[PDB]
Design a protein around this nucleic acid. Structure first.
Ligand SMILES: [Ca+2]
Ligand SMILES: [Ca+2]
Ligand SMILES: [Ca+2]
Ligand SMILES: [Ca+2]
Length: 293
DNA sequence: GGTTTCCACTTATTCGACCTCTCAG
DNA sequence: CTGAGAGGTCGAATAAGTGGAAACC
């Protein structure tokens, strides 16, 4: 296993990490509840190597299958959480997930004091959990109606450095070869697309990518009640002169690195105008077939 | 006996990956 | 004709989370 640059790791955690606070009804526990605090990343099987590298970097965490297609790294051994905290104190998250991290830290402090072994400490964990991720289940709310949770901190941080973006892109980004039929004797337009997807809660961060990368635009997307954003670059001069040199310098991790490598092969053919030939179109369709999914 | 840690594997829905058309220069 | 956006779809590699019991103090 290889170690991962810490800012790349934090950017990847902003895109792929989740904090965890289990408060479980437990007939064997003196206070009727047991707890489990943690941090986890779930990826496709093909990216198991990233999880082994993170495990090797931090020296913590257990890896297991997550269903038929995915694999997780989960850190819940309590002493190992100190490694997680030590990392994110030095290399802080910048999406809204930073607020979940802060709630995770509060829960750590409660459990370090063994307060979770008292009913009052369980109550304090429920207060913290109420704003963490999806919040309290209805079943738990019914158990602790008394609870009043402090409102959730809205995060508005800047991108700390390019390595963070390399990690974030390795998680939530997409390098895509768009083919769209036209009329023309050739008949197909080849267009390279770079995009990053994110929940609308981080509108500010996503909007800032345009200024930070000096190209792109934001698309708002919806699906029933859910909404998210796409930062998108389609202009070939920006792909060739901004996006490609950026990730050539700030190296992606995992399978997305291979997608980016194939994507650049297509950019080369496009720069040589080989995409407006039948022989070059063959080559590009071959590269596209071998990418992503 | 009580508590912590790990593995199996899911639900919810935020991602990624995928497609097609318009129209300015 | 070509490029750059416009305007989408869609499935789960989504983000998040639960049941059971091994493992331990
Ligand atoms: Ca993400
Ligand atoms: Ca994931
Ligand atoms: Ca991903
Ligand atoms: Ca088992």
């Amino acid at each position: 296993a290889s170690s991962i640059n810490p800012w790349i790791l934090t950017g990847f955690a902003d895109a792929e990490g989740s904090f965890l606070l289990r408060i479980r009804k437990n007939n064997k526990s003196s206070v009727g509840y047991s707890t489990e605090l943690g941090f986890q990343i779930t990826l496709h099987n093909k990216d198991k190597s990233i999880l082994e590298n993170i495990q090797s970097t931090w020296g913590v965490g257990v890896i297991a299958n997550s269903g038929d297609n995915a694999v997780s790294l989960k850190v819940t051994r309590f002493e190992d959480l100190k490694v997680i905290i030590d990392h994110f104190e030095k290399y802080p998250l910048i999406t809204q997930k930073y607020a979940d991290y802060m709630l995770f830290k509060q829960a750590f402090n409660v459990m370090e004091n063994k307060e979770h072994l008292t009913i009052e400490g369980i109550k304090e964990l429920v207060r913290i959990k109420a704003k963490l991720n999806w919040g309290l289940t209805d079943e738990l709310k019914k158990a602790f109606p008394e609870i009043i949770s402090k409102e959730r901190s809205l995060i508005n941080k800047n991108i700390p450095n390019f390595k963070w973006l390399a990690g974030f892109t390795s998680g939530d980004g997409c390098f895509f070869v768009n083919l769209s039929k036209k009329k023309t004797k050739l008949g197909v337009q080849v267009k390279l697309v770079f995009s990053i997807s994110q929940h609308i809660r981080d509108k500010n961060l996503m909007n800032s990518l345009i200024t930070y990368l000096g190209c792109g635009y934001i698309k708002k997307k919806n699906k029933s009640e859910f909404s998210w954003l796409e930062f998108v670059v389609t202009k070939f001069s920006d792909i060739r002169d901004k996006i490609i040199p950026f990730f050539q310098e700030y190296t992606l991790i995992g399978t997305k690195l291979k997608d980016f490598e194939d994507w650049c092969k297509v950019a080369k053919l496009i720069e040589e105008k080989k995409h407006l030939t039948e022989e070059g179109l063959d080559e590009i369709k071959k590269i596209k077939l071998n990418m992503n999914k």
